[PDB]
Structure 1
Amino acid sequence: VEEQGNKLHWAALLILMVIIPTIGGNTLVILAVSLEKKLQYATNYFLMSLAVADLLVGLFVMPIALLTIMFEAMWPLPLVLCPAWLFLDVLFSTASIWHLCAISVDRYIAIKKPIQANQYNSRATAFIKITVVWLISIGIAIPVPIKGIETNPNNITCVLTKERFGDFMLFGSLAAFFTPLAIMIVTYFLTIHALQKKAADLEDNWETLNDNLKVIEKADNAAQVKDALTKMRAAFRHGFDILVGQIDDALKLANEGKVKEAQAAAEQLKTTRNAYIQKYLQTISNEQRASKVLGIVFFLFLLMWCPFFITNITLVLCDSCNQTTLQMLLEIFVWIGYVSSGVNPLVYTLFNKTFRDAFGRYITCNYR
């Protein structure tokens, strides 16, 4: 008879490359938001909340998960801690995916509606959005402790069983991964359409005011400006006004009869328009550059969680598949997601200069 051997080396490899990078990676993100006041704004409370969720995985979920790998199938801890550990696993892992969904949506509405709210009014919006995400995560994770594990059986095997959590494995998976994925996919195309439209209207304005100064440049009479300059009447909230009244000021010279004086005044908007739309051009450029980074990073997160959730629902639907050689894959695919959830806030914040500069001095134990 050939029995299974030791697997301590795998657990050791997990500590080095999963647990330690998870706890440490999320600790840096939390510290950066907590210490550096330059990062203490509403948007980064999604990242801090997310970092906390993933931190608790590496602290209370991942270490105990080693015992399943390192020790026998029997639950070594007290029986009461079995559904709790199962609950915390589902809770925090779901919180990670739904946080990104929240961020994916929140980043989209920031593009469609640039002036969403003030600094104060958006600060409370964060807490509400964070709370909802956590409340969603609880409702998805709470079928586990309510149902419980199978209890003359003295000991217990702390594991989600297909014969019991069949509905939960299938539905929970849909509600925890495939549902936010569906949203992040929709908001993706919504974001792509938003950016290409936001720049389409800018190119429209940049071409319609240039066409109305060319007719202002080559002007024979003030009557030629009496209809052409009026077309520019409707084209930092002070931004739109500094050129509106400026264009209206030129019309005052047109009605007065000063044509040549108005043409030279129209050339004064050359340093006004260029310094304004180019400032709004990099606004879109940075908005497009930040969304592309968010897209790829969030994609890799979901992609690494894919092998688990696709296999998890397969364990339920496919009744023809080998149960033994399918749940053994789950025992590996979970850690792939654990790697994903662990380094998710870190990697995303490595593209931010302030976050990255903060991490550099926190490793050197500076803390300002």
Structure 2
Amino acid sequence: LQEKNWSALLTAVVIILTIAGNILVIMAVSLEKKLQNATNYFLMSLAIADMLLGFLVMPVSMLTILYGYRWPLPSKLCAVWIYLDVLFSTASIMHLCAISLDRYVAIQNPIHHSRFNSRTKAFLKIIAVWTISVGISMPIPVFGLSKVFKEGSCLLADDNFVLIGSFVSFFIPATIMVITYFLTIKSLQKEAADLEDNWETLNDNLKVIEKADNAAQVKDALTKMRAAALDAQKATPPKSPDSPEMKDFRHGFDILVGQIDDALKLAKEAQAAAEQLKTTRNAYIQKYLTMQSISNEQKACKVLGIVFFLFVVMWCPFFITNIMAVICKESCNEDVIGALLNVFVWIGYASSAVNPLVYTLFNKTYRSAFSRYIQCQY
């Protein structure tokens, strides 16, 4: 028991890293313009929930710890610490889960030429996240004042409250989160195979068109280039600020190939010289922007997979032991599994710390903001 005084300190480390880790994330997304992605707009709100969870309900989880788990505050405010903790936590899965199916639908749909709002779509999307988040949390204060106390410690004790609340707030979202996620990674991976194929196709026939000695050999070789070029025009990862240029440079590049074709049938010696995408800056940019754009979404999917994965890995101990309380009400000792719950809620409460760490470990631009922000300099 000499080493059990460390829990206070170790848990305070989990309280510190979450309040600081997500304070920067709120800062760094707002200040540095290079991180204004729609998916970085979600991350800025999520990180607020983790800031609000660290700032409100993780500490009194420790305050209770010090007292021996006998609830140390007024009787009357227990449903509000359960409510708050339920609400912010339930907003962190909703933020994660929204992100995954927001990115999922966009990859399996086209541009769709909507852009009704000017990247307030994030702002609309996030307020829907919280009202669904606070949709679910009204039942705790609705039956706020019993079903919230057990032997002088404060836990959700209504069996259906803690049974329904697992599927509605944890397993449905975690499953939804993961099911969409994997479909997308398989989808993105299977769309990079199309752009690379379309540029390889385009370059090989370009060499063929130049090196072909027959008169109409160009025809098959430069009609195919038109074919791939359109497919590329139809392909971009989810990511009108740079969408004209892609379309214009698609159109602008197509002109060069199109024109050579137009005068290819007419003819001959000159059209080989006419299809010279090798000599023009336009074509070189487009291969660049796509391969840089393809690779960026690779790393976003991986960084997101890390936060997705270790969110549900970390809270599953607390939810499996808790759902097992009600399923195993009679068979198994409740003083052991109640002990596991004192612990497995800090495996879970520690995810609020983790995701700022994984941002620095894999996003160069998130790293530089934090490092400066520690030094105070914008």
Question: If the length of structure 1 is used for normalisation, what is the TM-score?
Answer: 0.85
Say if 2:210 is the partner of 1:200. Answer: no
SS in 1 for 2:119: helix
**Contact 2:359 2:366 (8 Å CA) reproduced:** no
Per the alignment, residue 174 of structure 2 pairs with 181
**Of residues 79, 91, 97 in structure 2, which corresponds to 1:95?**
91
Q: CA deviation at 1:31?
A: 1.7
Give the whole-Å Cα distance in 2 for the aligned partners of 1:85 and 1:303. Answer: 24
Write the deviation string for residues 197-248 of structure 1: whole angstroms up to 9, x where unpaired.
2122223323433454355335455544456534433422112112211112
- 1:163-212 deviations in Å (ceiling 9; x for gaps): xx211212211122211211222122212221222122223323433454
The AA in structure 2 aligned to 1:11 is: A
Which residue number in structure 1 is paired with residue 241 of structure 2?
A: none
**Structure 1 residues 44-193: aligned runs within 5 Å:** 44-112=40-108, 115=111, 121=117, 123-148=119-144, 150=146, 157-161=153-157, 165-193=158-186
Distance (whole Å) between structure 2 residues aligned to residue 275 and residue 35 of structure 1: 29
Q: 2:24 and 2:139 mapped to 1: Cα distance?
A: 33
How far did 1:18 drift?
Answer: 0.9
Counterparts of 2:371 and 2:57, CA distance in 1: 28
Contact 2:49 2:92 in 1 (8 A): yes
What is residue 299 of structure 1 aligned with on the other side?
Answer: 309
Of 265, 285, 293 in structure 1, the residue corresponding to residue 295 of structure 2 is 285
Q: CA separation of 1:321/1:27 partners in 2, compared to 1, >3 Å: closer, same or farther?
A: same
Amino acid at match of 1:25: G
Match of 2:8 among 7, 11, 21: 11
Deviation at 1:334, TM superposition (A): 0.5
Amino acid aligned to 2:373: Y
State the Cα deviation string for residues 61-115 of structure 1 (Å, max 9, x = none): 0111122211144433223321111100111111112211122223334544574
Give the Cα separation in 1 of the matches to 2:113 and 2:192: 22
Match of residue 265 from structure 1: 274
Offset, 1:38: 4.0
- Cα gap change, 1:293 to 1:6, in 2 (>3 Å): closer
2:337 aligned residue (318, 322, 326):
326
Distance in 2 of aligned mates of 1:281 and 1:6: 52
Secondary structure at 1:321's aligned position in 2?
Answer: coil
Decide whether the 8 Å contact of 1:149 with 1:160 is kept in 2: no
More divergent stretch after superposition (320-329 vs 111-120): 111-120
Match of 2:374 in 1: 363
Shift of 1:303: 0.8
Higher relative contact order structure (alpha carbons within 8 Å, sequence separation ≥ 6)? 1
Aligned residues: 357
Matched, 1:43 2:68: no
Q: 1:266 to 1:98 in 2, by over 3 A?
A: same
Structure 2: which 5+ residue stretches go unaligned? 230-245
Deviates more, 1:69-78 or 1:295-304: 69-78
- 1:340 aligns with 351
TM-score by length of 2: 0.83
C-alpha displacement at 1:57, in angstroms? 1.1
Instruction: Label 1:207 to 1:344 Cα distance change in 2 as closer, same or farther (>3 A).
Output: closer
Letter in 2 for 1:98: M
Alignment check: 8 A CA contact 2:71 2:153 kept: yes
Q: Percent identity?
A: 59
Q: Which amino acid aligns with 2:269?
A: K
What is aligned with 2:236? none
Q: Kindly indicate whether the alpha-carbon contact (under 8 Å) linking 1:26 and 1:52 is maintained by their aligned counterparts in 2.
A: yes
In structure 2, the residue matched to 1:354 is: 365
1:48 Cα deviation after fit: 1.6
Q: Does 1:249 align with 2:246?
A: no
Amino acid at match of 2:48: V
Structure 1: which 5+ runs fail to align? none
